[PDB]
């Protein structure tokens, strides 16, 4: 099965700065120019929340400071500028083949005074 690997596992970024979260697939998750990579956000004590589907489509209601890019086996989630409510854990997930798989997740921390 296609394994997803997220780097790093923890990240600390300053308010107003850019956070870049990477996700590597073991095999290509492309099909017809459509990358089947999704991104979810999970805050403590809460179920995961969908942010982007199909690599770069922002789900409605999600702030435009979030964006996703990539194709083939390399994908990134970008948050710029990062805000305080963005402290959470982020997971990538592919839907190209079975079984469906998620990356290990990356915890984002905000640096303040």
């Amino acid at each position: 099965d296609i394994v997803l690997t997220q780097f790093p596992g923890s990240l600390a970024v300053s308010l107003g700065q850019r956070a870049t979260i990477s996700c590597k697939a073991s095999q290509r998750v492309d099909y017809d120019g459509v990358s089947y990579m999704n991104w979810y956000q999970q805050k403590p004590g809460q179920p995961p929340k969908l942010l982007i589907n199909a690599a770069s489509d922002l789900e409605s209601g999600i702030p435009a400071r979030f964006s996703g890019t990539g194709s083939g086996t390399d994908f990134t989630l970008n948050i710029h500028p990062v805000e305080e409510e963005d402290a959470a854990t982020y997971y990538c997930q592919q839907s190209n083949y079975d079984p469906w798989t998620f990356g290990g997740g990356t915890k984002l921390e905000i640096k303040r005074a």
């Binding site: 999704n38 179920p47 929340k49 789900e59 079984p99 998620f102």
Partner: protein
């Protein structure tokens, strides 16, 4: 608004089996597949398997083959999952999430989750 009401918390003794559920609403139940996920304590998620509620079709992650069985009941729009041979390591949170195969390919709405404790 799509709604995924899951069953409540469970404490189970090793060797036996629970049978959580998850009632859907807010869309036609048979239009989308129901996928299940094990969110073990303090870690990342694990896919368990999906089911097409229309024909009952099913596909599992192999690490959970033989442990979890997915079923559905259309008349009451509920997807239930059963876990057997339960053991200390099965202690975790289990979510049911809806997947839009013919809508755009996203697991759009998750349920709040069920906490199973084996002990």
């Amino acid at each position: 608004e799509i709604q995924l009401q899951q069953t409540g918390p469970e404490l189970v003794q090793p060797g036996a089996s629970v049978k959580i559920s998850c009632k859907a609403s807010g869309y036609s139940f048979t239009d989308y597949i129901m996928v299940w996920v094990k969110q073990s304590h303090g870690k990342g998620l694990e896919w368990i398997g999906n089911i097409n509620p229309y024909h009952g079709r099913t596909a599992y992650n192999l690490k959970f083959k033989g442990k979890a069985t997915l079923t559905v009941d259309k008349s009451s729009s509920t997807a239930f999952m059963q876990l057997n041979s339960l053991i200390s390591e099965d202690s975790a949170v289990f979510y049911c999430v809806r997947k839009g195969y013919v809508e755009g390919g996203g697991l759009d709405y998750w349920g709040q989750g069920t906490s199973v404790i084996v002990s």
